């Protein structure tokens, strides 16, 4: 279909991948750092979900260099994909209004 939809869908699929990879990689980077809490996979997936959406409750977060980098990748992927859905909707609404007018 139209490019924007292809870009929006693609940057959902990619986001889901980043959530799983970002969840597996955060546990890998954080174990070994005394005091770290992002160390088991289930809560790490929850952590990534609340990071990508930018809600960030503060119940869990990375304390190591690599865990933080992973965090930045998760943030950008989520923000980027949401900005791509908004842009795709605007295109659909704009192109659609050109008709109603």
């Amino acid at each position, epitope marked *: 279909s139209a490019l924007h939809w292809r870009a929006a869908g693609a940057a959902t699929v990619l986001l889901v991948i980043v959530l799983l990879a970002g969840s*597996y990689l955060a*546990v890998l980077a954080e*174990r070994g750092a*005394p*005091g*770290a809490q992002l160390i088991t996979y289930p809560r790490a997936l929850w952590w990534a979900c609340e990071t990508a959406t930018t809600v960030x409750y503060g119940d869990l977060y990375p304390v190591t260099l690599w865990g933080r980098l992973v965090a930045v990748v998760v943030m950008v992927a989520g923000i980027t994909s949401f900005g791509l859905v908004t842009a795709a909707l605007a295109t659909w609404f704009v192109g659609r209004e050109q008709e109603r007018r």
Partner: antibody
Amino acid sequence: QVQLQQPGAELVKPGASVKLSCKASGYTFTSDWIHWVKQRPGHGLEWIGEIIPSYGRANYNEKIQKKATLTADKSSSTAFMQLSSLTSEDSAVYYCARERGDGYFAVWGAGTTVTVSS
Amino acid sequence: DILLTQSPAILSVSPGERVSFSCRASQSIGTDIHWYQQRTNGSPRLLIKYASESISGIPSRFSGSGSGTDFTLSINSVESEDIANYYCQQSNRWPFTFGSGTKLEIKR
């Protein structure tokens, strides 16, 4: 069937080094971590370290002197623990255990009795 | 690193009575506590996970409760096969750590 198989025992001379093994069976996931626990007679469980075979990274108990070195073999599904320059202080039963990345030790090996003596 | 205190070190109960093991953490760890049973010459065996979740194959007699810093492992009506050492283990913060242990002793 026995999920984790370990050799019943190992004799080591003071100052030498031995390598323990832990052959895994049953379901294996990318999120599995293999742990090693040291237990001296009459005492409790002391965590030594862990390793994630799928990636090869390992971590160790900082509170104690580092006598171990962990490695894994994906093809033979075997986790190994190398103990070096031992003394009688290192004589104990060494257990391996499997954790599915969710914090608890679902299953343990029978344990290898290590004795350091000339 | 989180210190897990198990006191008393030995507990004596009469056959059939209700017994309770205590585990105290040096800081709040939610419900990230797990219990293990180790009989004489045996390897540890998972009894209860996440403070209160049951494992399959474990007698209904065993139960756990608590959250935060205080945890309890309970056995409704203890029997001879329950004679063993009991350990708690936390997974809230790295590195995982074990309590020192409580020995269950029965008075017959």
